[PDB]
Design a protein around this nucleic acid. Structure first.
Lengths: 151, 237, 116, 92
RNA sequence: GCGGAUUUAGCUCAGUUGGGAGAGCGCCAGACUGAAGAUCUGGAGGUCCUGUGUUCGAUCCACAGAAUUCGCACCA
RNA sequence: GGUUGCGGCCAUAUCUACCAGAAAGCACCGUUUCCCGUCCGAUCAACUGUGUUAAGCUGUAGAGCCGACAGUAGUGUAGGGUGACCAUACGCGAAACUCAGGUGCUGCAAUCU
RNA sequence: GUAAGCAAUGAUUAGAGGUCGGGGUCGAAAGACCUUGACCUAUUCUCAAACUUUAAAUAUGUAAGAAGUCCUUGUUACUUA
RNA sequence: UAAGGGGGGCUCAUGGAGAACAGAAAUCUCCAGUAGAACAAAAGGGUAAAAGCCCCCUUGAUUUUGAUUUUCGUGUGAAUA
């Protein structure tokens, strides 16, 4: 075929990670971590950091931002929470060449959080990607579940 | 190959099964510990059998001297499938008693009972004892508490072929553990805790009994985890 | 000019090999000797405690015996002063294997008289 | 480097043999002796003739030779000091 | 072998065994004078060397350290 | 006749294009109270569904890799000459360049035929 | 590693290919149209005491031989259970 | 005094491909690659079986020794079962 026949090489997923960018931190890391926790219902990871050139003053070593990785059918539930309502705010389809579907919705107010638990404006990421090469092939998994495409 | 003059890697390493770090600090002793699946006295997880042997001096590596087999359990009186808890304990006890060879009776013949020879025994110190004894090898996967490897170690130890041990990383007899997805039936070691879960019920995907690893079997041949199945092997050997 | 000790002059005799780099396999590791086994020598910075000396590589040798067990064993070789009993200590990995061909000459010769 | 100023360890001076709590300490000072070999020769007038070589000024040594880790036992009075590894700046 | 002085706002220093600190020179800004000087006003600038204690409460009292400074004894 | 393991053992043992097999034996498919672990089901689990997967084999030459016959530099022990070098006793004699060649070797264990 | 070489690392000579950058021109800054310089890579050609993939004759070490030692069966004590 | 012992778990620096965000990137991820990163302090050197990354508990910075050997004329020193 194109090695794609069975349910595996269709796609059983690995991880569908949620992230929130923390370009603030300090006191306000407790915003990002508690927002992840409120949507999923899971313990967030206060993250590692890659070894690159020392921007600002500190980059690596310090546990700077926060994400939460989730695998299995447990990942498909938190996927639906971002897809079925939060995609139909302000979002059209994003895909790279490899085919990474990100989310970035400044409406934190619709699903999960309100403006009451927040500090100010912000969005949150959902890297709801697919482990099968090329954006022709990743877009197959999302179109069988039918997402909001810009044609 | 790569840059400069360079060595391409070993075939069995690339093949993704043979390890070499485990092959360093393990083999040095050369007392009674070998098996054809991996090396040293291995208790594997399989769909069915394990072979279990001891050492023999040959040029290429170790050969069979004494040994048993897991399908040398319907020898006594198990007649079901190929897959549970009780078989791991039973096959460990079987090889320990079978210091003859696979075609044989449950007697000594070769020389060994525990190891090759006897040796000293002081009082207990840690770190550096004189460990001239049998390694019951894990082989591959995680050393989880309650596992079949350590259940087989219990049968092996005072059964004959003596591997020492504490009671930390181990299962028991009464309490093994054990996870469940829903259908309906049970098997076990003796009876234990799975028959206590039988107030709510639902347990099964993957056959039963005779040889190593997988479970209970759903169809009504014996609905409760009774002692009569296991004791037909255990008291008979 | 130079200082002595480790890598000076014969850097190769300290060194591993570019082709055979990386951790040493279980070849000469598990091959322990006894009386009258002819052997060779070449070191590396892979085996830390019990590394042989660099000046006393180059030379071949024979194993006297393995004394007690495996480690602390010896290889006989002359040093270029004059003929004297000199050896060298090391552990097992550095020791190799060579010419066990020559001594089999006597057993080949003894098939003589019965051809009458 | 710093060795801790109390550890538990083996019974070094084997008055127990089996492992005990030790106390890692240092020695004392007191007087000046007065009766001691070089002091007897110095203020006397000796080294015979030849200079004023009567055992003279500062007979010296370097910075930190070994380190004073004296493992006092809790059973007996017994002392153990070994061959202690080096330090450039230690404190008690 | 053993003891004395000193460390206070940038700088100059006033001043103290428990109710927790003070003024000039300088720095800035507004008045003021025909202008610079002089001088008021407002902005200020220090948890009184530092680590850790005592007390209802600490610049202050304690144990201990940093560091500038000063003297006798040394062995003879 | 086949499947799986243990290897010894490293570049003639290496990679791609592309085909083909399934329950003796192997591997994917799919999911979780509670132990047990976390970021996550990595311990443990029925009838069945299926070649996705990976070990393996057939088909195959595109490339790693590989090679006669022949051609040939230096030179000890010495022995003949030259300004910036050249040429010989006497014992041996390559890459470069080529007819051409090429899908490992060997021992052991368990089970079916 | 003499030998021989530019794989790797080191120092520069040649054809051309061409992202972005730079220059020119029309444009309020913003935007649009062109074009001299890139890796890559193909073709062409230089080249290094701390640069070496491949790796002699000839001298030398160290071991062993030309100058006679190999192998079967049984017993005893140590090591060794 | 952990910047040691033992258990358990893991494989990079880095690039490409973008993601609301972005400031290269922060966090993450699909895809590709694997001892070129990491190394008190210099230079060499070892290494993925990890000598690198990650998490928790331990105190061996240990007593009494040494066959057999390194090996300098020595003073003096090492391997060390």
């Amino acid at each position: 075929s194109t090695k794609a026949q069975n349910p595996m090489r269709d796609l059983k997923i690995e991880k569908l990670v949620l992230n929130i960018s923390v370009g603030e931190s300090g006191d306000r890391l407790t915003r990002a971590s508690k927002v992840l926790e409120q949507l999923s219902g899971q313990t967030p990871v206060q993250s590692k950091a890659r070894y690159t050139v020392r921007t600002f003053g500190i980059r690596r070593n310090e546990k700077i931002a926060v994400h939460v990785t989730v695998r299995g059918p447990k990942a498909e539930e938190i996927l639906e929470r971002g897809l079925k309502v939060k995609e139909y705010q302000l979002r059209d389809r994003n895909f790279s060449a490899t085919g990474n579907f990100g989310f970035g919705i400044d409406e934190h107010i619709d699903l999960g959080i309100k403006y009451d638990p927040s500090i100010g404006i912000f969005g949150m990421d959902f890297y709801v990607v697919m482990n099968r090469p090329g954006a022709r092939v990743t877009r197959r998994k999302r179109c069988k579940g039918t997402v909001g495409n810009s044609h | 190959a790569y840059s400069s003059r360079f060595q391409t890697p070993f075939r069995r390493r690339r093949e993704g099964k043979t390890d070499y770090y485990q092959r360093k600090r393990l083999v040095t002793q050369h007392k009674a510990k070998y098996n054809t699946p991996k090396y040293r006295l291995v208790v594997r997880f399989t769909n069915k059998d394990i072979i279990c042997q001891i050492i023999s001096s040959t040029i290429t590596g170790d050969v069979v001297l004494a040994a048993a087999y897991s399908h040398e359990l319907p020898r006594y009186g198990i007649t079901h499938g190929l897959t549970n808890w009780a078989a791991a304990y039973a096959t460990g006890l079987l090889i320990a008693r079978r210091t003859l060879q696979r075609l044989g009776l449950d007697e000594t013949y070769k020389g060994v009972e525990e190891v090759e020879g006897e040796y000293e025994l002081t009082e207990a110190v840690e770190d550096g004892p004189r460990p001239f004894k049998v390694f019951l090898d894990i082989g591959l996967q995680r050393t989880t508490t309650g596992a079949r490897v350590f259940g087989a170690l219990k049968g092996a130890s005072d059964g004959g072929l003596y591997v020492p041990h504490s009671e930390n990383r181990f299962p028991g007899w009464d309490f093994e553990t054990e996870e469940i997805d829903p259908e309906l039936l049970r098997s076990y070691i003796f009876g234990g805790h799975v028959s206590q879960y039988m107030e709510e019920l639902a347990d099964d995907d993957e056959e039963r009994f005779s040889e190593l690893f997988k479970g209970y079997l759903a169809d009504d041949i014996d609905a409760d985890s009774l002692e009569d199945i296991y004791t037909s092997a255990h008291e008979a050997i | 000019g130079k200082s002595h000790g480790y890598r000076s002059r014969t850097r190769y005799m300290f060194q591993r090999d570019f082709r055979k780099h990386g951790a040493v396999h279980l070849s000469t590791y598990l091959k322990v000797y006894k009386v009258g086994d002819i052997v060779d020598i070449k070191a590396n910075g892979s085996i830390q405690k019990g590394m042989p000396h660099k000046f006393y590589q180059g030379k071949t040798g024979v194993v006297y015996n393995v004394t007690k067990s495996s480690v602390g064993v010896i290889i006989n070789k002359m040093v270029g002063n004059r003929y004297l009993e000199k050896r060298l200590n090391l552990r097992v990995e550095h020791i190799k294997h060579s010419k066990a061909a020559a001594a089999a000459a006597a057993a080949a010769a003894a098939a003589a008289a019965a051809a009458a | 480097v710093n060795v801790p100023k109390t550890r538990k360890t083996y019974c070094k001076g084997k008055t127990c043999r089996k492992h005990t709590q030790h106390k890692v300490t240092q020695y004392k000072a007191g007087k000046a002796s007065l009766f001691a070999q070089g002091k007897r020769r110095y203020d006397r007038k000796q080294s015979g003739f030849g200079g004023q070589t009567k055992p003279v000024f500062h007979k010296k040594a370097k910075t930190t030779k070994k380190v004073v880790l004296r493992l006092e036992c809790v059973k007996c009075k017994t002392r153990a000091q070994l061959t202690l590894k080096r330090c450039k700046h230690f404190e008690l």
